[PDB]
């Protein structure tokens, strides 16, 4: 499974592109920025097939 | 009593005036310090490359 | 390339880019495409005493040839060099040499501790805002 | 700083320079003009030159922004959609905004138009308007004497403790575009050629006039003074033996002819002399319209102690602008150190980045507090909509 290989690979936050409202308290506007996602926030080809040789 | 009353009214106005002066003074320092440190960090990662 | 490199307010970096013209891609296994591209660059954007005026002051010289001194930037137009010390890339060509410098960069930075150029997991713990922290 | 990705835009009189806060370079530097291709097609974009390389009939490079640094074609400037999508490739409604010429306090309106342009026309959820000569002073100085020789002219702005000396903000006429007219005028016999033509004139200002401009000069003294001094020097060198620096050829290769355009050193000096002495081009312009007595903007700043203003300005001179990147600052040092020798001219200048120094100052966006600048909410439009 692709996700099993992926979680088996490269061994941890997540991050989001979200509207933040900034603080001065909060501004009457808001704006997008990459906010920190917190803790609670397919198929395979075999290689050597596309290998140029 | 009259002169100390007038001085008491003079002091409050002076104190109120100073804060908005020093609000302009302290923001002048730190934003320039930010603009200095941005002018620092403009060159910092530059030489690393 | 002429309208790209002649619009620079810096008159000197224009010539240094003008003399390191690199043409890459899977098409660019074509021979002479880069060569006549360079020749057409010298045709369109090379600043010189032109053959009418350099011939005219060749004739003024035969009366040692001086040059009318121009002020513009693209006076020398050249290409750049490919590393011939990779026999795998000497053999399989340099049309996709972007992968070659990627291989050289990978042996550089990854076999180095330098995470000023790659995001770590802890660097993700700024995210892709640390992708803005790991650029070259 | 704070977790923000503001959009940093500098709108000069000729150049629209756009990128974000998290990129210290602009994503694009297109004109603040457009080849209105003729449908009307407001062709923004520098290379989109090539349309004006067609020199096409109906193609009309009108400016969006006149010589005051304020736009006169605002919905064709809403170029802003062209910026955010064709150049920035982002929604403006995502990101905050920093946008950059000083005035006397009257047009403080255009913000309402930016309330149009950032809330109604583009719906940028928050936009900060910064002062461009004050931004040039920022990128870490508090007070300055900013002279921007941009495309619009010589724009002099005194700045005392961050406040704008409103009576002393003077903007000259004579900068990039008048020198485009000048280089088109004087090399006219040598180019053998001699807005709508902005497709001829702006295109030539993109191809060869700039190629004579970044390659024009200013005399470090007055050119009449340098001319008499160098003629005296050459007379000394000739009479002692039995060379003038001004008799040498600065030939120009007019690439639409590939032809030698021999203008001398004094000849290329004479164009930028009109920025300090515009009586040499037309009688309706005084030497006061030149950059030397523009001294007057120091003196009008003396009324905000006037010698303390002189101390601050003439020891905190700032040089910026596109036409100031024409060689010759030392003209400013000479020309204002003769009108004010009292405080020695300790000048500051971005020397490269100078033509986009308002963009870099607006980029300094990357302030550590949203409270350091006025960031306009949609509610700030709603407050300005009342009374």
CB spacing of B31 vs D138 below 8 angstroms: yes
Neighbours of C82 (CB within 10 A): 14
Query: What's chain D look like in SS3?
Result: CCCCCCEEEEECCCEEEEEECCCCCEEEEEECEEEEECCCEEECCCCCCHHHHCCCCCCEEEECECCCCCECCCCCCCCHHHHHHHHCCCCCCCCCEEECCCCCCCCCCHHHHHHHHHHHHCCCCCEEECCHHHHHHHCCCCCEEEEEECCCCEEEEEEECCEECHHHCEECCCCHHHHHHHHHHHCHHHHCCCCCHHHCHHHHHHHCHHHHHCCCECCCCCHHHHHHHHHHHHHHHHHHHCCCHHHCEEEEEECCCCEEEEEEHHHHHHHHHHHHCHHHCCCCCCHHHCCCCCCHHHHHHHCCCHHHHHHHHHCCEEEECCHHHCECCHHHHHHHHCCCCCCCCCEEECCCCCCCHHHHHHHCCCCCCHHHCCEECHHHHHHHCCC
Structure solved using which method?
cryo-EM
Neighbours of C135 (CB within 10 A): 10
Retrieve residue B25's tokens.
């003074």
Q: Are strands D7-11 and D97-99 parallel, antiparallel or unpaired?
A: parallel
Q: What is the DSSP string of C36-70?
A: HHHHHHHHHT--SS-HHHHHHHHHHH--------B
Nearest to A32 among D94, D376, D378 (CB): D94
| Same domain membership, residue D121 and residue D19 | yes
**Does residue B48 belong to the interface with chain C, where contact is any CB pair within 8 Å?**
yes
Per the DSSP assignment, residues forming a β-bridge with D29 are: D17
Residue D178 CA, distance from chain mean position: 12
- Closest alpha carbon to D155 in D146, D164, D163: D146
Alpha-carbon distance of D13 to D70, in angstroms, equals 7
The CATH number for D46's domain is 3.30.420.40
Retrieve residue C76's tokens.
């020398």
Query: Given in angstroms, what resolution was this structure solved at?
Result: 6.9
Alpha-carbon distance of D257 to D259, in angstroms, equals 5
Retrieve residue B12's tokens.
């409050």
Number of Cβ pairs closer than 8 Å across A and D? 46
| Same domain membership, residue D277 and residue D182 | yes
Neighbours of D261 (CB within 10 A): 23
Retrieve residue D123's tokens.
């719906």
Residue C132 CA, distance from chain mean position: 26
Neighbours of D135 (CB within 10 A): 25
Per the DSSP assignment, residues forming a β-bridge with D359 are: none
Alpha-carbon distance of D17 to D83, in angstroms, equals 9
Token pair 């006549």 is found at C36
> Which helix (H) or strand (E) element contains residue C72?
none
Chosen from C12, C57, C71 to mutate, greatest number of chain D CBs within 10 A:
C71
Retrieve residue D296's tokens.
């007057």
| Same domain membership, residue D42 and residue D2 | yes
Length of chain C in terms of residues written = 136
Q: How far is the CA of A22 from the CAs of C2, D22, D126, D343, D382, in angstroms?
A: 46, 17, 11, 44, 19
| Same domain membership, residue D164 and residue D196 | no
Number of Cβ pairs closer than 8 Å across B and D? 41
The shortest C-alpha distance from A5 to chain C (Å) reads 18
Name the residue in chain A with its Cα closest to that of C122: A12
Residues B34, B40, B45, B49: what is their CA dihedral angle, to the nearest 10 degrees? 150
Q: Which residues of A are less than 8 Å from D96 in CB distance? A: 29, 31
> Which helix (H) or strand (E) element contains residue B18?
helix B2-48
Residue D320 lies in domain: 133-173+287-357
**Does residue A15 belong to the interface with chain D, where contact is any CB pair within 8 Å?**
no
> Which helix (H) or strand (E) element contains residue B29?
helix B2-48
Q: Which residues of D are less than 8 Å from A23 in CB distance? A: 370
Give the SS3 label for residue C108: helix
CB D7 within 8 A of CB D92: yes
Cross-sheet strand order for the sheet of D375-376: D26-31, D15-20, D7-11, D97-99, D127-129, D375-376
Token pair 């004050």 is found at D134
**Does residue B35 belong to the interface with chain D, where contact is any CB pair within 8 Å?**
yes
Chosen from A15, A19, A20, A22 to mutate, greatest number of chain D CBs within 10 A:
A22
Residue D121 CA, distance from chain mean position: 26
Alpha-carbon distance of D181 to D169, in angstroms, equals 25
Alpha-carbon distance of D214 to D324, in angstroms, equals 10
| Same domain membership, residue D323 and residue D280 | no
CB D353 within 8 A of CB D360: yes
The shortest C-alpha distance from D141 to chain B (Å) reads 6
Name the residue in chain A with its Cα closest to that of C125: A13
In angstroms, the first-to-last Cα distance of chain B is 72
- Closest alpha carbon to D141 in B41, B29, B20: B29
Q: Please name the residue ranges forming H helices in chain C.
A: 2-5, 13-18, 33-44, 51-61, 87-91, 98-105, 121-124
Alpha-carbon distance of B11 to B25, in angstroms, equals 20
CB D367 within 8 A of CB D373: yes
| Same domain membership, residue D291 and residue D165 | yes
Neighbours of D220 (CB within 10 A): 18
CB spacing of D140 vs B34 below 8 angstroms: yes
Alpha-carbon distance of C67 to D324, in angstroms, equals 30
Q: Which residues of C are less than 8 Å from B48 in CB distance? A: 116
| Same domain membership, residue D364 and residue D224 | no
Given D261, D286, D311, the domain boundary residue is D286
Residues 6+ apart with CB under 8 A from D205: D176, D177, D180, D184
The CATH number for D263's domain is 3.90.640.10
Alpha-carbon distance of D44 to C95, in angstroms, equals 34
Alpha-carbon distance of D31 to D381, in angstroms, equals 29
| Same domain membership, residue D29 and residue D114 | yes
Q: Which residues of D are less than 8 Å from A31 in CB distance? A: 4, 94-96, 125-126
Residues 6+ apart with CB under 8 A from D122: D78, D80, D81, D84, D92, D93
Nearest to B38 among D141, D162, D364 (CB): D364
Retrieve residue B45's tokens.
């990662």
Q: Is the dihedral of CA D165, D171, D175, D176 positive or negative?
A: positive
Inspect the structure and tell me whether chains A and D have 3 or more CB pairs less than 8 Å apart. yes
Retrieve residue C134's tokens.
């790991």
The shortest C-alpha distance from C16 to chain A (Å) reads 36
Given D286, D310, D326, the domain boundary residue is D286
Q: Are strands D144-149 and D317-320 parallel, antiparallel or unpaired?
A: parallel
CB spacing of D215 vs C69 below 8 angstroms: no
Name the residue in chain D with its Cα closest to that of A17: D94
| Same domain membership, residue D121 and residue D64 | yes
Segment 34-53 of chain C within 8 Å of chain D by CB: 45, 47-50, 52-53
Query: Taking every pair of C-alpha atoms in chain A, what is the biggest distance, in angstroms?
Result: 63
Give the SS3 label for residue C29: helix
Inspect the structure and tell me whether chains D and C have 3 or more CB pairs less than 8 Å apart. yes
Alpha-carbon distance of D239 to D262, in angstroms, equals 27
CB D184 within 8 A of CB D331: no
Alpha-carbon distance of B38 to D364, in angstroms, equals 7
Per the DSSP assignment, residues forming a β-bridge with D61 are: D35
- Taking each helix axis as running N to C, give the angle between helix D265-276 and helix D223-241, from 0 to 180 degrees, rounded to the nearest 10: 150
- Closest alpha carbon to D215 in D325, D351, D320: D325
Alpha-carbon distance of D67 to D154, in angstroms, equals 10
Given D253, D286, D319, the domain boundary residue is D286
| Same domain membership, residue D166 and residue D300 | yes
**Does residue B11 belong to the interface with chain D, where contact is any CB pair within 8 Å?**
no
What is the number of domains present in chain D? 3
CB spacing of C127 vs A12 below 8 angstroms: no
DSSP one-letter code for C109: I
CB spacing of D366 vs B28 below 8 angstroms: no
| Same domain membership, residue D236 and residue D208 | yes
Q: How far is the CA of D42 from the CAs of D169, D180, D214, D269, D307, in angstroms?
A: 32, 22, 27, 35, 49
Residues 6+ apart with CB under 8 A from D60: D35, D36, D38, D195, D196, D198, D199
Name the residue in chain C with its Cα closest to that of B48: C136
Token pair 């690199």 is found at C22
Retrieve residue D312's tokens.
């601050």
CB D346 within 8 A of CB D336: no
DSSP one-letter code for C117: S
Token pair 């020798």 is found at D341
- Dihedrals φ, ψ of C80, to 5°? -105, 170
Alpha-carbon distance of D354 to D95, in angstroms, equals 26
Residues 6+ apart with CB under 8 A from C82: C94, C97
CB D153 within 8 A of CB D174: yes
Nearest to D138 among B29, B30, B35 (CB): B35
The shortest C-alpha distance from B49 to chain C (Å) reads 5
Alpha-carbon distance of C5 to C63, in angstroms, equals 38
Length of chain D in terms of residues written = 387
Q: Which chains touch A (3 or more CB pairs under 8 A)?
A: C, D
> Which helix (H) or strand (E) element contains residue C136?
none
**Does residue C128 belong to the interface with chain A, where contact is any CB pair within 8 Å?**
yes
- Closest alpha carbon to D214 in D222, D202, D205, D201: D205
Inspect the structure and tell me whether chains A and C have 3 or more CB pairs less than 8 Å apart. yes
CB D15 within 8 A of CB D322: yes
Q: Which residues of A are less than 8 Å from C118 in CB distance? A: none
Alpha-carbon distance of D140 to A12, in angstroms, equals 37
- Dihedrals φ, ψ of D368, to 5°? -75, 0
CB C38 within 8 A of CB C23: no
| Same domain membership, residue D196 and residue D58 | no
- Closest alpha carbon to D129 in D10, D3, D5, D20: D10
Q: Is the dihedral of CA B32, B37, B43, B46 positive or negative?
A: negative
Give the SS3 label for residue A31: strand
CB D92 within 8 A of CB D118: yes
- Dihedrals φ, ψ of B18, to 5°? -60, -40
Long-range CB contacts (within 8 A, 24+) of C77-85: C77/C18, C77/C19, C77/C21, C77/C38, C77/C41, C77/C42, C77/C45, C77/C46, C78/C18, C78/C19, C78/C20, C78/C21, C78/C38, C79/C19, C79/C20, C79/C21, C79/C22, C79/C23, C79/C34, C79/C38, C80/C19, C80/C20, C80/C21, C80/C22
Alpha-carbon distance of C1 to C38, in angstroms, equals 10
Q: How far is the CA of D306 from the CAs of C46, D160, D311, D380, in angstroms?
A: 55, 12, 9, 37
């Amino acid at each position: 499974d692709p996700q099993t290989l992926i979680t088996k690979a490269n061994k941890k936050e997540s991050w989001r592109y979200d509207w933040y409202q900034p603080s001065k308290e909060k501004y009457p506007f808001r704006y997008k920025t990459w906010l920190r996602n917190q803790e609670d926030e397919e198929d395979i080809l075999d290689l050597k097939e596309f290998d140029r040789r | 009593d009259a002169l100390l009353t007038n001085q008491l009214y003079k002091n409050h106005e002076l104190l109120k005036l100073e804060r908005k002066k020093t609000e302009a003074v302290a923001r002048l320092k730190s934003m320039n310090k930010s603009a200095i440190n941005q002018y620092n960090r403009r060159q910092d990662k530059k030489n690393k490359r | 390339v002429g309208l790209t490199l002649d619009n620079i307010d810096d008159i000197n970096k224009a010539k240094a880019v003008w003399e390191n013209i690199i043409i890459v891609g899977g098409t660019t296994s074509i021979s002479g495409f880069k060569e006549a591209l360079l020749g057409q660059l010298l045709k369109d954007h090379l600043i010189i005493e032109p053959e009418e005026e350099k011939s005219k002051r060749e004739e003024e010289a035969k009366s040692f040839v001086p040059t009318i001194e121009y002020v513009q930037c693209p006076t020398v137009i050249k290409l750049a060099k490919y590393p011939d010390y990779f026999p795998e890339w000497k053999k399989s060509g340099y049309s996709e040499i972007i992968f070659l410098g990627a291989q050289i960069v990978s042996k550089q930075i990854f076999t180095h501790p330098k995470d000023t150029f790659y995001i770590t997991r802890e660097k993700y713990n700024k995210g892709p805002a640390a992708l803005w922290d790991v650029q070259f | 700083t704070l977790n923000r990705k503001c959009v940093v835009i500098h709108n000069g009189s000729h150049r629209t320079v756009a990128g974000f806060s998290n990129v210290e370079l602009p994503q694009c530097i297109i004109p603040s003009s457009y080849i209105k291709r003729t449908e009307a097609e407001f062709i923004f974009g520098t290379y989109n030159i090539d349309a004006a390389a067609e020199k096409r009939n109906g193609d009309e490079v009108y400016t969006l922004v006149d010589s005051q640094g304020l736009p006169y074609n605002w919905d064709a400037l809403e170029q802003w959609r062209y910026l955010y999508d064709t150049q920035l490739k982002v929604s403006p409604e995502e990101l905050p905004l920093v946008i950059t010429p000083a005035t006397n306090g009257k047009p403080d309106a255009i913000l309402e138009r930016y309330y149009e342009l950032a809330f109604d026309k583009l719906n940028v959820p928050v936009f900060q308007i910064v002062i461009e000569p004050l931004a040039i002073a920022l990128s870490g100085k508090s007070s300055a004497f900013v002279i921007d020789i941009g495309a619009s002219g010589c724009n002099v702005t005194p700045i005392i403790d961050g406040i704008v000396v409103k009576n002393a903000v003077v903007r000259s006429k004579f900068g990039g575009d008048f020198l485009d007219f000048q280089v088109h005028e004087r090399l006219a016999p040598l180019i053998k050629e001699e807005q709508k033509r902005s497709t001829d004139v702006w295109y030539e200002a993109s191809t060869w006039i700039q190629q004579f401009k970044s390659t024009l000069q200013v005399s470090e003294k007055d050119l009449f003074e340098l001319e008499r001094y160098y003629k005296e020097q050459a007379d000394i060198y000739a009479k002692q033996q039995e060379n003038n620096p001004l008799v040498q050829k600065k030939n120009f290769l007019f690439k639409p002819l590939n032809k030698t355009l021999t203008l001398d050193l004094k000849e290329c000096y004479q164009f930028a002399e009109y920025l300090f002495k515009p009586q040499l081009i037309s009688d309706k312009f005084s030497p006061e319209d030149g950059l030397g007595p523009l001294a007057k903007s120091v003196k009008k700043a003396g009324a905000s102690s006037p010698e303390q203003v002189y101390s601050l300005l003439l020891t905190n001179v700032i040089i910026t602008g596109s036409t100031s990147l024409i060689e010759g600052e030392q003209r400013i040092i000479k020309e204002l150190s003769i009108r004010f020798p009292q405080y020695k001219l300790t000048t500051f200048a971005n020397q490269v980045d100078r033509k986009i120094q308002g963009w870099l100052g607006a980029l300094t966006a990357n302030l550590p507090s949203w409270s350091l600048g006025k960031w306009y909410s949609k509610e700030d439009y709603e407050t300005l909509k009342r009374d």
